[PDB]
Structure 1
Amino acid sequence: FERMFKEFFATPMTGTTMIQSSTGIQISGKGFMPISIIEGDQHIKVIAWLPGVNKEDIILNAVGDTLEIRAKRSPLMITESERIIYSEIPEEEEIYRTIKLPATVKEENASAKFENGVLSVILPKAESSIKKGINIE
């Protein structure tokens, strides 16, 4: 019966509770917020999809190796004559993600951008987490 739900393509609504994730990193939180972690040698780039969110409704906090993204998207306002006959868009207003990074970061030098509903965060690595090349042979 679990395929039957997959055949409905209700996946964005029901199947997005990000209680946990294990890939060497820990992601927890509530709501729909797809994440991409890009690791460089000197920095970390985090990409979060926040469609329908205004820049001012984003709380972006970091310390050490943990990053917090808190956001609220206003729900779709409808006049009384109007009615939602079809919707795949999640109704959850308050969403947040807590990302445990693999590396310690300098939050004082971090930067972020919000374009087209995409948040791009630049997190410089702390020197303690900057790796060093082992010379081969």
Structure 2
Amino acid sequence: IQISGKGFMPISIIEGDQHIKVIAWLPGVNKEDIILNAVGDTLEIRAKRSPLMITESERIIYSEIPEEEEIYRTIKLPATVKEENASAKFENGVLSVILPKAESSIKKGINIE
């Protein structure tokens, strides 16, 4: 597999026998500012959060949180997933996207003596 993008964005890939549950923390991002796309065995994520606005009377004295907004990731899945039958959920800034496996190896397996 290969990951590509820009911006701090940890992701967790949970493979299954019928899907590949993927988790990714996206705090501060609205529900609509997420353009999610996918096809075959590759995932295309798009996201963006508004900048840290401050009033003229306010002032930033110490902040370790990044500031860049445009952030995305492009993962190349090993097998194909049914994008048409896929779903996703975004709660508490946590994007949980399900990728049902497509014409995957049936992995029927072999009988062992």
TM-score (normalizing by structure 2): 0.94
Query: Where in structure 2 are there 5+ consecutive unaligned residues?
Result: none
Structure with higher helix content: 1
Does the CA contact (< 8 Å) of 1:42 and 1:130 recur in 2?
no
Does the CA contact (< 8 Å) of 1:37 and 1:44 recur in 2?
yes
Does the CA contact (< 8 Å) of 1:41 and 1:130 recur in 2?
no
Does the CA contact (< 8 Å) of 1:43 and 1:125 recur in 2?
yes
What do the CA deviations read for 1:81-127 (whole angstroms, capped 9, x no partner)?
11111111111101000011111011000000000100000010012
Q: Distance in 2 between matches of 1:78 and 1:100?
A: 39
Residue 130 of structure 1 and its aligned partner are, at CA, apart by 4.1
Q: Distance in 1 between matches of 2:43 and 2:105?
A: 16
Closer, same or farther: CA 129–98 of 1 in aligned 2, 3 Å: farther
Does the CA contact (< 8 Å) of 1:49 and 1:119 recur in 2?
yes
Which structure's relative contact order is higher, taking Cα pairs within 8 Å and 6+ residues apart?
A: 2
Q: Distance in 2 between matches of 1:118 and 1:110?
A: 17
Among 44, 47, 61, the alignment partner of 1:85 is 61
Query: Where in structure 1 are there 5+ consecutive unaligned residues?
Result: 1-24
TM-score (normalizing by structure 1): 0.78
